[PDB]
């Protein structure tokens, strides 16, 4: 079963970009390593940052809504005029602090 | 086409200003500026924010003249900006509403008690979506977004 | 030398111009002359952060990848926005739909090359210059990419006749068009930091030998 | 006006933690009382130690 990015953010599938960003800031501030010292907080914050990195991009959100996480990470078959038969699948870079830095403009929110 | 409903019961002087500026029945003001939204351009578009047009003088966003003069007072703030498509004036401060209008692209509750909301967008969801999807440089649209015609759709 | 456009400016030289009447700022390795911008926006409240950060490096204001201001997303609004902890400055759009702000400025000052005057010598080192005639010695802070022509241009107040001198390092003549590393004066600053001593005592010295004053 | 910790360490505001530690190590070795006998060296060393103490902590650096 794929990871539900909307359920990770704790919101609805048809939530707008403001609701996605409001879910991210509340959950990132709650599960930040500087504020939360739980061992599972780092994994939860990494999942939330990965979920936000998909849903903030309209192209990543559209593929994930159409084909799921399996289609998004594994790529989709290109139906028109491509040498590569599949798209470059979405790979998370594994740095949840980079999504935090992009969202909050720095390391300190 | 972007069709707007104007809450004349809530903001009568405001909606009359917008409707006359839509129709252009006032002609020219005392400063020689046409009081009509034809060829008035959307000079400011903000992603997940608003699209701003109605600069009937230069299209630069620093000017604009209402039908009661250069600026008219804020009528009320009863209408909230709680949804996408809320129509109000962009002003230079308190009691400085002109001809420049903004259409909200999402719920913007922070705009309450600062800008007079007087209406909503009722037709043209794809038109507003394409205007939102127009790329911008420092919130100014790269493409040339213009109001080709304006007035009363049922006249 | 009247129309000589200097390509490299030291951080001390950039910090020397930190006035409203002569304002130089540096970010991402480039030096920008915003004197015209300050004269245009004199009396504006948006000029105050620029006057405050005048003569200082503002690379922390800008994203190194996109060469624009760093962008934060406001938690209340859910929107992307330039992050200005010190307040809004020139050519930055406001927070709200405001009809007193105009987008007619076109390209901003941080994106246009009109205000750019050259590059910043972020990496720099001291070199001693010792004459073999009068036994005089100076210490000059020069860049690694700075040529010996630019080094002698900086040294020209100290010796206007130094263009007629033969520049030598460890007994061999220096190439005039080359840099210090190309000539052979290696940069041992990282070695000195690893080995933990003072590098001022062992700043490399260039010997000037007199030939004629013609 | 407060003391500029970046100017005391001789680094820019965009310097990383490794550059802060390297600038602190070089300046502390130069201005140590066992090596430098100048009267101003003790005050300069105290300012550098205060500058490193602020900039090493991410929370103190964020507040500053």
Nearest alpha carbon to residue A50 among A67, A34, A31, A35: A31
Task: For residue A21, list chain C residues with Cβ-Cβ distance below 8 A.
Answer: 73, 75, 78-79
Contacts of C24 (CB under 8 A, 6+ apart): C9, C14, C16, C17, C18, C31, C32, C33, C34, C35, C54, C55, C117
End-to-end CA distance of chain C: 20
How would DSSP label each residue in C102-162? --TT-S-TTT-SSSEEEEE--SEEEEEEEETTT--EEEEEEESS-BHHHHHHHHTTT-TTG
Q: How far apart are CA B57 and CA B34, in angstroms?
A: 8
Pairing between strand C137-143 and C116-120? unpaired
3-state SS class at A85: coil
Structure obtained using = cryo-EM
DSSP chain C: --S---SEE-HHHHHH-BSSSSBEEEETTEEEE-HHHHHHTTT-TTHHHHHHTTTSB-TTTB-TTTSSB-EEEETTTTEEEE--TT---TT---SS--TT---TT-S-TTT-SSSEEEEE--SEEEEEEEETTT--EEEEEEESS-BHHHHHHHHTTT-TTGGGSEEEETTEEPPSSSBHHHHT----HHHHHHHT--SSTT--EEEEE-----
Q: A18: which 2 tokens?
A: 């403001």
What's the distance, CA C42 to chain centroid? 24
Query: Where do we find the tokens 């263009």?
Result: C163
Residues of A within 8 A of D59 (CB-CB) are 34, 108
Residue A75 to residues A50, A83, A91, B138: CA-CA distances in angstroms?
Answer: 17, 14, 10, 34
Q: How far apart are CA C183 and CA C142, in angstroms?
A: 15
Mutation target among C60, C70, C75 for the A interface, most CBs of A within 10 A: C75
Kind and range of the H or E run holding A93: none
Q: DSSP readout, D34-62? A: TT---HHHHHHHHHHHHHHHHHHSHHHHH
Q: Which tokens sit at D51?
A: 């500058």
User: Residues with Cβ < 8 Å from B37, sequence gap 6 or more?
Assistant: B21, B22, B24, B54, B56, B99, B147, B150
Minimum CA–CA partner of B107 in chain C: C77
- Whole-angstrom CA distances from C170 to C53, C154, C173, D48 are 43, 22, 9, 37
Tokens representing D43 are 């005050």
Task: Please list the residues that pair with B72 across neighbouring strands.
Answer: B97
- Give residue ranges of B with CB < 8 Å to any A CB: 48, 106-107
Q: Which two tokens stand for residue D4?
A: 């500029």
**Between the CA of residue A41 and those of A29, A44, A96, what are the distances in Å?**
11, 5, 12
CB count, 10 Å around CB of C73?
Answer: 23
Give B38-107 as a 3 state SS string. CCCECCEECCCCEEEECECCCCCCCCCCECCECCECCCCCCCCCCCCCEEEEEECCCCCEEEEEEEECCC
Q: What is the resolution of this structure in A?
A: 4.1
What are C120's strand-pairing partners?
C9
DSSP string, B109-154: GGGTTTS-EEEEEEE-HHHHHHHHTS-EETTEESS--B----S-TT
| Residue C77 forms contact with A (CB below 8 Å) | yes
Whose CA is closest to C120, among C17, C34, C6, C3? C6
Determine contact, residues B132/B51, Cβ cutoff 8 Å.
yes
For residue A86, the SS3 value is: strand
**Residue of D12, D25, D63, D64 to mutate, testing the C interface (most C Cβ within 10 Å of its Cβ):** D12
Q: Is C72 annotated as a binding residue?
A: yes
**Angle ∠(B21,B150,B142) on CA atoms, nearest 5:** 100
Q: Considering only CA atoms, which of C36, C38, C40, C32 is closest in space to residue C57?
A: C32
Listed residue (B52, B50, B24) closest to B37, CA to CA: B24
Q: How far apart are the first and last CA of chain B?
A: 15
Q: B11 to each of B17, B37, B76, B88, B118, how far by Cα in Å? A: 10, 20, 7, 11, 6
**What are the φ and ψ backbone dihedral angles of C13, each rounded to 5 degrees?**
-65, -40
Distance of CA B133 to the CA centre of its chain: 18
Instruction: Give strand pairing partners of C131.
Output: C208
Burial B30-55 (b: 16+ CB within 10 A, else e): eeebbbbbeebbbbbbbbbbbbbbbb
Distance CA B113, CA B93 (A): 11
> What number of other Cβ atoms are within 10 A of residue C165's Cβ?
21
Contact C81, C75 (CB under 8 A): no
* Whole-number Å distance between alpha carbons of A95 and A101: 10
Residue B101 φ/ψ, nearest 5 degrees: -120, 160
Beta-carbon contacts of B65 under 8 Å, excluding residues fewer than 6 positions away, are B29, B31, B33, B35, B56, B57, B98, B99
Closest CA to D30 of D60, D8, D13, D63: D8
């Amino acid at each position: 079963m794929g990871q539900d990015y909307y359920s990770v953010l704790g919101i609805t599938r048809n939530s707008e970009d403001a609701q996605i960003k409001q879910a991210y800031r509340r959950l990132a501030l709650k599960h930040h390593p500087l504020k939360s010292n739980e061992p599972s907080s780092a994994e939860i914050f990494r999942q939330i940052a990965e979920a936000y990195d998909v849903l903030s991009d309209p192209m990543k959100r559209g593929i994930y809504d159409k084909f799921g996480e399996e289609g998004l990470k594994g790529g989709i078959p290109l139906e028109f005029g491509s040498q590569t038969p599949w798209t470059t699948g979405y790979v998370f870079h594994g740095k949840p602090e980079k999504v935090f830095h992009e969202f909050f403009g720095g390391n300190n929110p | 086409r972007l069709i707007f409903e104007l809450y004349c019961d809530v903001c009568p002087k405001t909606c009359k200003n917008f409707q006359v500026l839509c129709t252009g029945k006032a002609g020219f003001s005392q400063r020689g500026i046409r009081l009509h939204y034809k060829n008035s351009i959307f000079h400011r578009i903000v992603q997940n924010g608003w699209i701003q047009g109605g600069d009937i003088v230069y299209g630069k966003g620093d000017n604009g003249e209402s039908i009661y003069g250069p600026t008219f007072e804020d009528e009320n703030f009863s209408v909230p900006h709680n949804k996408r498509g809320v129509l109000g004036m962009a002003n230079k401060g308190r009691h400085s509403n002109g001809s420049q209008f903004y259409i909200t692209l999402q719920a913007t509750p922070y705009l309450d008690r600062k800008f007079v909301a007087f209406g909503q967008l009722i037709e043209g969801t794809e038109v507003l979506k394409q205007l939102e999807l127009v790329p911008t440089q420092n919130e100014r649209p790269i493409h040339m977004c213009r109001i080709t015609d304006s007035g009363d759709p049922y006249a | 030398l009247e129309y000589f456009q200097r390509r490299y400016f030291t951080p001390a030289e950039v910090a020397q111009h930190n006035r409203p009447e002569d304002l130089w700022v540096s970010y991402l390795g480039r030096v920008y002359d915003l004197t015209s911008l300050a004269q245009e926006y004199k009396g504006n409240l948006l000029l105050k952060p620029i006057v405050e950060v005048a003569g200082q490096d503002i690379s922390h204001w800008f994203d190194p990848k996109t060469r624009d201001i760093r962008k934060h997303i406001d938690p209340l609004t859910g929107c992307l926005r330039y992050c200005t902890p010190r307040g809004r400055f020139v050519h930055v759009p406001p927070q709200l739909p405001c009809s007193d702000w105009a987008n007619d400025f076109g390209k901003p000052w941080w994106q246009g090359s009109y205000y750019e005057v050259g590059r910043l010598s972020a990496k720099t080192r001291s070199i001693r210059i010792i004459n073999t005639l009068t036994s005089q010695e100076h210490t000059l802070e020069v860049g690694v990419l700075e040529s010996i022509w630019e080094i002698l241009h900086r040294y020209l107040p100290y010796n206007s006749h130094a263009a007629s001198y033969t520049w030598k390092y460890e007994g061999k003549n220096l190439n005039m068009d080359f840099t210090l590393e190309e000539n052979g004066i290696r940069d041992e600053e990282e070695e000195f930091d690893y080995l933990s001593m003072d590098g001022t005592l062992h700043t490399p010295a260039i010997l000037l030998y007199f030939n004629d004053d013609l």
